[PDB]
Amino acid sequence: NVADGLAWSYYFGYLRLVLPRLELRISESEYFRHKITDRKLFILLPKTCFDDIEQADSRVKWVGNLPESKINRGGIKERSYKHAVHEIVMPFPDGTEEKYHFIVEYATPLMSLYDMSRFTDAQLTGSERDHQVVLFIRKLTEILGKSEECKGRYELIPFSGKIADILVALHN
Amino acid sequence: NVADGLAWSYYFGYLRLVLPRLELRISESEYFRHKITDRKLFILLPKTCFCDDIEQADSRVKWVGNLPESKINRGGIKERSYKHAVHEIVMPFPDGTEEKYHFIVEYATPLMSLYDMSRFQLTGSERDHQVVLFIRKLTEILGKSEECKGRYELIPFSGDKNKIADILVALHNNA
Numbered sequence: 032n033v034a035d036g037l038a039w040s041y042y043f044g045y046l047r048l049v050l051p052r053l054e055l056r057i058s059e060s061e062y063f064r065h066k067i068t069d070r071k072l073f074i075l076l077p078k079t080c081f082d083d084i085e086q087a088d089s090r091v092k093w094v095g096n097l098p099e100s101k102i103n104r105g106g107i108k109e110r111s112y113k114h115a116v117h118e119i120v121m122p123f124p125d126g127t128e129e130k131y132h133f134i135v136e137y138a139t140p141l142m143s144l145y146d147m148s149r150f151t152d153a154q155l156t157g158s159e160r161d162h163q164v165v166l167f168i169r170k171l172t173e174i175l176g177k178s179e180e181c182k183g184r185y186e187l188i189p190f191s192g193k194i195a196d197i198l199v200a201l202h203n
Numbered sequence: 204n205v206a207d208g209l210a211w212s213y214y215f216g217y218l219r220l221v222l223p224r225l226e227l228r229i230s231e232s233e234y235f236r237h238k239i240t241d242r243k244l245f246i247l248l249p250k251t252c253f254c255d256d257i258e259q260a261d262s263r264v265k266w267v268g269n270l271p272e273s274k275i276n277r278g279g280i281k282e283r284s285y286k287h288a289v290h291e292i293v294m295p296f297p298d299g300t301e302e303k304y305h306f307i308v309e310y311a312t313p314l315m316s317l318y319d320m321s322r323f324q325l326t327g328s329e330r331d332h333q334v335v336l337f338i339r340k341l342t343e344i345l346g347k348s349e350e351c352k353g354r355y356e357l358i359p360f361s362g363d364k365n366k367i368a369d370i371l372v373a374l375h376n377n378a
């Protein structure tokens with residue numbers, strides 16, 4: 032499957048690298064370390080969308096990035112791996128609000144699957160793309176479920192194209 | 204195929220973004236703009252065996268710095284950093300002389316996950332076939348890409364680990 036290769040590469044080539052570094056990168060962020068509501072990476076997995084999170088939910092906006100990890104990989108001495116912090120503002124019946132700060136990003140391989148459906152040379156119809164997205168979510172779920180270094184450091188968020196509601200509910 | 208998804212992702216998520224920017228990043232480098240004359244990304248494609256550190260493998264290859272980074276809003280990450288490294292090659296010649304070259308060279312990172320998929324549900328011969336399919340598909344993708352034309356060189360090789368400098372200098376001289 033196309034999705035199985037994208038899922039394993041997403042683990043070996045990214046999550047396995049950054050998730051063991053996440054807590055250290057947070058603690059180095061003088062601006063965010065005391066603000067971060069939850070110390071996990073929230074990975075958005077839209078099934079029919081597509082990459083700006085604010086355009087998916089107006090209550091979520093980017094406010095800053097964590098300090099980058101510099102990793103020697105692929106002949107690149109200091110390749111940059113950094114996460115983004117997003118602020119969630121939940122309006123209430125009182126007319127009041129309450130703010131949260133989450134480390135959240137889209138699953139990047141899903142963006143390539145969408146790009147593969149917009150070019151016929153990639154041999155991916157819209158129907159086949161939606162199936163491969165589901166296969167990607169399932170394979171990535173079982174890979175991370177058996178991971179030692181990533182244990183307790185992530186949260187997968189599959190949804191159909193509400194994000195702020197899901198994130199706030201999961202934190203509670 | 205597994206290799207087809209990795210090749211398309213390598214194009215849509217990287218090459219299609221950085222190759223149209225490469226010329227500009229080179230010209231923005233005060234130190235490297237006149238030292239790098241092959242203004243293209245040399246992509247190493249190890250086929251048989253595969254460490255990813257280029258400079259410790261060959262005493263003639265040394266990392267001497269980075270180009271200016273490209274910043275692209277992507278996947279919810281604002282200003283995600285895409286940056287190339289520059290390697291200096293000091294090539295001894297048979298007559299005792301030395302010649303100095305500068306290259307933008309890097310490994311095709313998706314191949315690293317293919318080797319990781321095997322050395323930790325993919326047999327060795329299955330990996331070798333998927334690597335071959337990745338190279339073929341990537342060659343086809345880039346051959347039809349107008350925004351990547353003249354900006355790349357694909358280098359399939361065994362993985363000769365201490366022969367990269369020989370391969371790069373030969374390719375510069377169109378050998």
Ligand SMILES: Nc1nc(=O)c2ncn([C@@H]3O[C@@H]4COP(=O)(O)O[C@H]5[C@@H](O)[C@H](n6cnc7c(N)ncnc76)O[C@@H]5COP(=O)(O)O[C@@H]3[C@@H]4O)c2[nH]1
Nearest residue numbers: 040041044045112139140212213216217278284285312313
């Ligand atoms: N959110 C996020 N931030 C990152 O820094 C990151 N780096 C990789 N990935 C995703 O993990 C998976 C495996 O990574 P890999 O390096 O093998 O392939 C990458 C890699 O070969 C190349 N590439 C992308 N960015 C860079 C970069 N900055 N330097 C060198 N190569 C890069 O193009 C491929 C696809 O990139 P992405 O399409 O962004 O998704 C990747 C991929 O799905 C990332 N995802």
